[PDB]
Motif scaffolding. Structure first.
Motif, PDB file in Angstrom:
ATOM      1  N   UNK A 199       0.934  -1.262  -0.053  1.00 57.30           N
ATOM      2  CA  UNK A 199       0.241   0.221  -0.090  1.00 57.30           C
ATOM      3  C   UNK A 199       0.543   1.562  -0.138  1.00 57.30           C
ATOM      4  N   UNK A 200       1.720   1.493   0.459  1.00 53.10           N
ATOM      5  CA  UNK A 200       2.864   2.593   0.330  1.00 53.10           C
ATOM      6  C   UNK A 200       3.620   2.753  -0.110  1.00 53.10           C
ATOM      7  N   UNK A 201       3.636   2.694  -1.593  1.00 49.90           N
ATOM      8  CA  UNK A 201       3.881   2.936  -2.618  1.00 49.90           C
ATOM      9  C   UNK A 201       3.411   3.502  -3.274  1.00 49.90           C
ATOM     10  N   UNK A 202       1.629   3.483  -3.600  1.00 50.10           N
ATOM     11  CA  UNK A 202       0.742   4.164  -3.675  1.00 50.10           C
ATOM     12  C   UNK A 202      -0.188   4.838  -3.168  1.00 50.10           C
ATOM     13  N   UNK A 203       0.415   5.106  -2.107  1.00 49.55           N
ATOM     14  CA  UNK A 203       0.293   5.840  -0.537  1.00 49.55           C
ATOM     15  C   UNK A 203       0.804   7.555  -1.078  1.00 49.55           C
ATOM     16  N   UNK A 204       2.214   6.955  -1.599  1.00 52.06           N
ATOM     17  CA  UNK A 204       3.151   8.310  -1.791  1.00 52.06           C
ATOM     18  C   UNK A 204       2.490   8.576  -3.149  1.00 52.06           C
ATOM     19  N   UNK A 205       2.656   7.621  -3.930  1.00 42.75           N
ATOM     20  CA  UNK A 205       2.124   8.177  -5.458  1.00 42.75           C
ATOM     21  C   UNK A 205       0.844   9.126  -5.358  1.00 42.75           C
ATOM     22  N   UNK A 206      -0.040   9.068  -4.625  1.00 44.16           N
ATOM     23  CA  UNK A 206      -1.053   9.560  -3.999  1.00 44.16           C
ATOM     24  C   UNK A 206      -0.953  11.262  -3.403  1.00 44.16           C
ATOM     25  N   UNK A 207       0.084  10.777  -1.935  1.00 44.89           N
ATOM     26  CA  UNK A 207      -0.242  12.114  -1.436  1.00 44.89           C
ATOM     27  C   UNK A 207       1.022  13.485  -2.051  1.00 44.89           C
ATOM     28  N   UNK A 208       1.682  12.385  -3.254  1.00 53.09           N
ATOM     29  CA  UNK A 208       2.830  13.574  -3.168  1.00 53.09           C
ATOM     30  C   UNK A 208       2.685  14.219  -4.630  1.00 53.09           C
ATOM     31  N   UNK A 209       0.936  13.891  -5.400  1.00 53.27           N
ATOM     32  CA  UNK A 209      -0.032  14.660  -6.568  1.00 53.27           C
ATOM     33  C   UNK A 209      -0.970  16.017  -5.549  1.00 53.27           C
ATOM     34  N   UNK A 210      -1.012  15.596  -4.334  1.00 55.40           N
ATOM     35  CA  UNK A 210      -1.905  16.626  -3.905  1.00 55.40           C
ATOM     36  C   UNK A 210      -0.394  17.299  -3.343  1.00 55.40           C
ATOM     37  N   UNK A 211      -0.225  16.596  -2.294  1.00 55.16           N
ATOM     38  CA  UNK A 211       0.112  17.874  -0.964  1.00 55.16           C
ATOM     39  C   UNK A 211       2.300  18.052  -1.693  1.00 55.16           C
ATOM     40  N   UNK A 212       2.832  17.831  -2.954  1.00 55.69           N
ATOM     41  CA  UNK A 212       3.963  18.242  -3.224  1.00 55.69           C
ATOM     42  C   UNK A 212       5.041  16.713  -3.315  1.00 55.69           C
ATOM     43  N   UNK A 213       5.599  16.309  -3.529  1.00 57.95           N
ATOM     44  CA  UNK A 213       7.070  15.914  -3.799  1.00 57.95           C
ATOM     45  C   UNK A 213       8.286  15.082  -2.981  1.00 57.95           C
ATOM     46  N   UNK A 214       8.144  16.482  -2.123  1.00 59.13           N
ATOM     47  CA  UNK A 214       9.393  16.314  -1.730  1.00 59.13           C
ATOM     48  C   UNK A 214       8.425  17.156  -0.310  1.00 59.13           C
ATOM     49  N   UNK A 215       7.317  16.862   0.273  1.00 59.43           N
ATOM     50  CA  UNK A 215       6.895  16.773   1.403  1.00 59.43           C
ATOM     51  C   UNK A 215       6.486  15.605   1.513  1.00 59.43           C
ATOM     52  N   UNK A 216       6.143  13.962   0.963  1.00 54.58           N
ATOM     53  CA  UNK A 216       6.146  13.167   1.347  1.00 54.58           C
ATOM     54  C   UNK A 216       7.392  12.643   1.785  1.00 54.58           C
ATOM     55  N   UNK A 217       7.892  11.224   2.039  1.00 55.68           N
ATOM     56  CA  UNK A 217       9.263  10.994   2.575  1.00 55.68           C
ATOM     57  C   UNK A 217       8.348   9.253   2.456  1.00 55.68           C
ATOM     58  N   UNK A 218       8.925   8.524   1.999  1.00 46.86           N
ATOM     59  CA  UNK A 218       8.678   6.653   2.379  1.00 46.86           C
ATOM     60  C   UNK A 218       9.484   6.521   2.912  1.00 46.86           C
ATOM     61  N   UNK A 219       9.653   5.313   4.289  1.00 42.33           N
ATOM     62  CA  UNK A 219      10.774   4.955   4.867  1.00 42.33           C
ATOM     63  C   UNK A 219      10.450   3.567   4.769  1.00 42.33           C
ATOM     64  N   UNK A 220      11.185   2.427   5.104  1.00 43.93           N
ATOM     65  CA  UNK A 220      11.247   1.433   5.794  1.00 43.93           C
ATOM     66  C   UNK A 220      12.200   0.297   5.918  1.00 43.93           C
ATOM     67  N   UNK A 221      12.685  -0.421   5.977  1.00 45.96           N
ATOM     68  CA  UNK A 221      13.442  -1.444   6.533  1.00 45.96           C
ATOM     69  C   UNK A 221      14.729  -1.859   5.054  1.00 45.96           C
ATOM     70  N   UNK A 222      13.615  -2.670   4.172  1.00 44.81           N
ATOM     71  CA  UNK A 222      14.409  -3.133   3.073  1.00 44.81           C
ATOM     72  C   UNK A 222      14.435  -2.440   2.444  1.00 44.81           C
ATOM     73  N   UNK A 223      15.004  -2.754   1.099  1.00 46.72           N
ATOM     74  CA  UNK A 223      16.259  -2.389   0.118  1.00 46.72           C
ATOM     75  C   UNK A 223      14.877  -1.589  -1.162  1.00 46.72           C
ATOM     76  N   UNK A 224      14.992   0.002  -1.393  1.00 43.72           N
ATOM     77  CA  UNK A 224      13.881   0.408  -2.454  1.00 43.72           C
ATOM     78  C   UNK A 224      14.267   0.158  -3.348  1.00 43.72           C
TER      79      UNK A 224
END
Ligand SMILES: NC(=O)c1ccc[n+]([C@@H]2O[C@H](COP(=O)([O-])OP(=O)(O)OC[C@H]3O[C@@H](n4cnc5c(N)ncnc54)[C@H](O)[C@@H]3O)[C@@H](O)[C@H]2O)c1
Ligand SMILES: NC(=O)c1ccc[n+]([C@@H]2O[C@H](COP(=O)([O-])OP(=O)(O)OC[C@H]3O[C@@H](n4cnc5c(N)ncnc54)[C@H](O)[C@@H]3O)[C@@H](O)[C@H]2O)c1
Lengths: 308, 307
Positions: free
Chosen positions: B13-38
């Protein structure tokens, strides 16, 4: 014959539990434990051992070394100090629970943990509260006890962990530090013999479920001694009586007609009293295993006055 | 213009949510995070940062440094893998939540944590499940998600924590890499490449389901919603409910030579019977004006386009 460890057993209920169990199994087969220093009399009652419940490594030692097979998990931070210290109450209650679960699971221990009238919320049935209903408490103490019920039950389904849980009403005992929402009902008997006048901090008609200590511990032992097959669930309500400060004040006046009562309500304690149920329905507890209380309002008052 | 951090956002879900939020609030205003290699493509989508949820000190850093005001807490171990590793799933789902809570409260952060249909048990209302009911789940993931609900709401009534929570149904998306509701994703990847899918759930076993777009949109909309229009902090989010047989039916509207062989895995079947069949979202629709877009017909059409 089982070897017993009582966790956090220097509080209100722990000593009483130690006495009942030592009579049932032998002085040396019940190990009392807490983080606090024990009064001289309780230390000489039988084995006592320091035990910090947040320190998991130490619990393994104690359980292995003393060959513990029965554990009663009494250590917690209650609704009183819980709210003032959310971080610590979370640690002692939830992390402490996990540790006790893990140890008991690894070393085949039969595990008792109490739950409470605080495990219910404003969205719960209150007249009475059944065993299976909405539980949405707004206290860290209750939330952690809801977690206790669920985790305990899960560990019984995932592993064969013998987890048993009674929801205690407010417990009344002779010499009990302060509290505490249901605390007036302990302190009232002190002031009844001291002066004849008592200031109460809850509303005259705030009905709560209550129980004498003998009943609380007798239920605790019984459910633990019960045959597994007769337990359709692992968390039970336990019940004896429900009363109000006014109803308690009459029972006192039956023996001491001069007894005088005043009121100065604490909103903090009153707010969480209103959030609790008024009556506990223990249909299942009476049906499954043979639960019967020996104390109601008259005899409770009689015994409590007999200690003064 | 809020500054967002998505925790454990390399899953479904996180990747899709990143996409949605970045289109709404701005690319650099949404930080994606995990422990795995993206993956490469996702790394270049916008700011990415390693964030272990069990590491409280690292969360304090990230939240302060990147001035985070909105947090979406997606890190978890789900129902299937959690039963295998109880101690690990307990840490990540419980102490991970505790850490996320403490950080969100201290730094005045709007916190989103999703609950699930898994937060119900065999003693719960199943048809449909209301917002307020008995919750006695018999899975560790389920027990930790109830804990999530109660703790989050407590911190709202205790401190000023803006905790907002949705109970997701089994989410369906095209880009998905062995859970309970997994059948409804592995079906399309075996539907276009005709034409027999082996289902591991009984023919008439209803579960609440939803397409990723609705899930992500509700997640944004509930966060955008005015605080005073929220009568509670945990809402059921609903769209559709179906059985495997019903899903095979709507696939025939596009590919009539489709067939199913039911070889039922009892372990996932048993917990599917412990879950609700329908979620009632009255409150969601009432309070903050929730409305789904994808029902069974137009779910299948969208999914097949990706093949
Ligand atoms: N007394 C009641 O009326 C009542 C009502 C409902 C439920 N209960 C439950 O019964 C249980 C025992 O009740 P109580 O009233 O005796 O509690 P209490 O507050 O009287 O005593 C709790 C004990 O736990 C100990 N403790 C705290 N942190 C610890 C740690 N890290 N390690 C070990 N010990 C620690 C304290 O020293 C204290 O002696 C509790 O779980 C409580 O929730 C009691
Ligand atoms: N997708 C669904 O079907 C569904 C349904 C109901 C609820 N939910 C909830 O939605 C959220 C997201 O689900 P998802 O489908 O992405 O799950 P997922 O299993 O695909 O993703 C979980 C992610 O969290 C990460 N993670 C694990 N441990 C971590 C740690 N210690 N620190 C940091 N990150 C860690 C994992 O690497 C993984 O990328 C979860 O909270 C889940 O409970 C999902």
């Amino acid at each position: 014959p089982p070897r017993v460890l009582i966790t956090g057993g220097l509080g209100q209920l722990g000593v009483g539990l130690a006495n009942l169990l030592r009579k049932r199994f032998g002085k040396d087969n019940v190990i009392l434990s807490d983080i606090r220093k024990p009064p001289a009399h309780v230390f000489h009652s039988g084995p006592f051992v320091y035990a910090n419940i947040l320190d998991y490594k130490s619990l393994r030692e104690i359980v292995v070394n003393h060959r513990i097979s029965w554990l009663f998990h009494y250590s917690a931070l209650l609704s009183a100090v819980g709210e003032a210290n959310v971080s610590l109450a979370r640690d002692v209650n939830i992390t402490g629970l996990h540790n006790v679960l893990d140890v008991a699971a690894e070393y085949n221990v039969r595990l008792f943990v109490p739950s409470t009238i605080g495990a219910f919320g404003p969205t719960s049935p209150r007249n009475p509260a059944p065993d299976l209903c909405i539980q949405r408490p707004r206290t860290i103490y209750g939330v952690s006890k809801v977690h206790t019920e669920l985790m305990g039950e899960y560990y019984y389904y995932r592993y064969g962990l013998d987890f048993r849980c009674l929801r205690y009403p407010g417990i009344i005992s002779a010499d009990s530090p302060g509290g505490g929402t249901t605390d007036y009902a302990v302190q009232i008997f002190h002031a009844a013999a001291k002066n004849g006048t008592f200031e109460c901090n809850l509303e005259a008609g705030t009905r709560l479920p209550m129980m004498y200590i003998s009943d609380c511990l007798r239920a605790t032992l019984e459910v633990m001694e019960a045959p597994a097959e007769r337990l359709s669930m692992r968390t039970y309500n336990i019940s004896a009586m429900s009363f109000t400060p006014e109803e308690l004040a009459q029972a006192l006046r039956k023996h001491a007609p001069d007894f005088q009562i005043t009121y100065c309500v604490d909103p903090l304690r009153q707010a969480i009293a209103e959030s609790w149920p008024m009556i506990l329905d223990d249909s299942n507890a009476r049906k499954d295993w043979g639960w019967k209380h020996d104390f109601d309002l008259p005899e409770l008052v009689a015994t409590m006055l007999n200690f003064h």
